[PDB]
């Protein structure tokens, strides 16, 4: 009974950052060495946990958040960051514990002419709270006039599409990001390593 880390990392398609997937992981054996002993990652940044010192530790739940962002925006996947992605799409708490993992996925998530399938929220009245997901597509009202769900002046669609093209520079290229979150409540521990 091993933990299904392969499902989230090996997934054929990832979610848009505004609709980031969260995989609940429990009552399984966690071989974390399949992750850190790899060489396909360009960013493996851990906060407050040692990935090699979790095999002897047990948790109640582990969350694997997955989505695709730009290379420029990977720096926003970190506690205490600001920007379009941290404020409006995916926010980490200041006391975040876990690892954020990213790797270049130009070969998979970029199509000639542009993928235009991965989206990110561009407009929002207020910043997201940590670990909050907003899938609203309501027309963003930038003025005093109600929009009645129609686009136009002072009325913007809150979602914008990434221009993922193979020609683009490295920072513009799509990057698949997996964020590992560790939870330890008073419930019995179910996620143990070898």
């Amino acid at each position: 009974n091993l933990c299904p880390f392969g499902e989230v990392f090996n997934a054929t398609r990832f979610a848009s950052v505004y609709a980031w997937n969260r995989k609940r992981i429990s009552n399984c054996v966690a071989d974390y060495s399949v992750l850190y002993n790899s060489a396909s990652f360009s960013t493996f940044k851990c906060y407050g946990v040692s990935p090699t010192k979790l095999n002897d530790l047990c948790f109640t739940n582990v969350y694997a958040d997955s989505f695709v962002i730009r290379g420029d925006e990977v720096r926003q996947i970190a506690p205490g960051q600001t920007g379009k992605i941290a404020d409006y799409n995916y926010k980490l708490p200041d006391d975040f514990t876990g690892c954020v993992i990213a790797w270049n996925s130009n070969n998979l998530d970029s199509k000639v002419g542009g993928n235009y399938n991965y989206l990110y929220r561009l407009f929002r009245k207020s910043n997201l709270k940590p670990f909050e997901r907003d899938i609203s597509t309501e027309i963003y009202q930038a003025g005093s006039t109600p929009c009645n769900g129609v686009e136009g002046f002072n009325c913007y669609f809150p979602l914008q599409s990434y221009g993922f093209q193979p020609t683009n520079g490295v920072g513009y290229q799509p990057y698949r990001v997996v964020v590992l979150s560790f939870e330890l409540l008073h419930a019995p521990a179910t996620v143990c390593g070898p």
Epitope: F123, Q141, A142, G143, G163, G169
Partner: antibody, heavy 117, light 108 residues
Framework: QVQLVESGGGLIQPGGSLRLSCAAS????????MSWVRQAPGKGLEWVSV???????FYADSVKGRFTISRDNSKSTLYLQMNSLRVEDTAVYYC???????????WGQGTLVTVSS | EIVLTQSPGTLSLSPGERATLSCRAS??????LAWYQQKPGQAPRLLIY???SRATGIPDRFSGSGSGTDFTLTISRLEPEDFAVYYC?????????FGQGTKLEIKR
């Protein structure tokens, strides 16, 4: 009918403090990206700072630590507090409504800031 | 930073002809470019966004093209007062940057 009217420009000594104002009509200030752009006299345009709809603020490296962008929705006004001013900061400062931190679809008439002893 | 170079620095055309302004970038911006018009004594006026699309109220004579690194602003049917300073601004990567400008004058 979108209006952006600026004020507060003038002459201030180097190292002094100045604060520009930008009244806005025709759209909600707090619900939009707002940016300050300055054009030095006889030079090109330069982006200075931006405030997000959510309230996050970003600044250019030349003006970082000195300038502060803010808004007061009760007066529909965008502010730019300029402290520790320098002679190089001398420029005509513009107020621009920013479309998602990408481009400026509406511009204010501009106000002139002169920094000299 | 990304540096944008506009070519030519200036040009002198006649009413009714066609003017071709260019913007060249230090890196790729993937059509994340905008163009502005600044008549003397007045604020910049948005002309095109996304390197192709006109803004609200922009006449059909103005057109945008190009992508990646090289761009072209093609104003046709030049009116007598169509002449001002035109800037190109990229927003693909922070900090957002402008060009030094390209002046445009009427030959009478």
């Amino acid at each position: 009918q979108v209006q952006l009217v600026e004020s507060g420009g003038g002459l201030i000594q180097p190292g002094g403090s100045l604060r520009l104002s930008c009244a806005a009509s025709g759209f909600t200030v707090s619900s939009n990206y707002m940016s300050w752009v300055r054009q030095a006299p006889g030079k090109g345009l330069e982006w200075v700072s931006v405030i997000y709809s959510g309230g996050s603020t970003f600044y250019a490296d030349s003006v970082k630590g000195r300038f502060t962008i803010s808004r007061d929705n009760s007066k529909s006004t965008l502010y730019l507090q300029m402290n520790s001013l320098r002679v190089e900061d001398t420029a005509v400062y513009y107020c621009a409504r920013d479309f998602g931190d990408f481009y400026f679809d509406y511009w204010g008439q501009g106000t002139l800031v002169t920094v000299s002893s | 930073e990304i540096v944008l170079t506009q070519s030519p620095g200036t040009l002198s055309l006649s009413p009714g002809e066609r003017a071709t302004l260019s913007c060249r970038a230090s890196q790729s911006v993937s059509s994340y470019l905008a163009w502005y018009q600044q008549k003397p004594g007045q604020a910049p006026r948005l002309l095109i966004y996304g390197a192709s699309s006109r803004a609200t109220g922009i006449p059909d004579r103005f057109s945008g093209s190009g992508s990646g690194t090289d761009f072209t602003l093609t104003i046709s049917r030049l009116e007598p007062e169509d002449f001002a300073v035109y800037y190109c601004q990229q927003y693909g990567s922070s900090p957002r940057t402008f060009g030094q400008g390209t002046k445009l004058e009427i030959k009478r």
